[PDB]
Amino acid sequence: TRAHLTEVESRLERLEQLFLLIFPREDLDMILKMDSLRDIEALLTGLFVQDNVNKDA
Amino acid sequence: TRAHLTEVESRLERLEQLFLLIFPREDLDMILKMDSLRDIEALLTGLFVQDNVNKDA
Question: What else does the entry mention about this protein (chains A, B)?
């Protein structure tokens, strides 16, 4: 019992804080832009959706 | 004595693969839903946007 964790833990953990393919650096739009196919902004840009829905039923 | 990395590395690294507040389990919509304020689906649901833009200029 004189090693493990602490350093290494802070290591892969530090890698966990750096992320890989989640947080590039800034801008919180590339996410929803890469996940959404604009089928909403499109379904509306062409079908002009108009109605109520609200949240939590 | 040999140690560090391997186990611990796979440890915090395993924690990195489990994520914390990024991947809940399965949705693919909760992300863009929590990032986007529906100001687009709204700006269109009320202002009915219609025009060309394309990608990459």
Answer: Present with 166 molecules/cell in log phase SD medium.
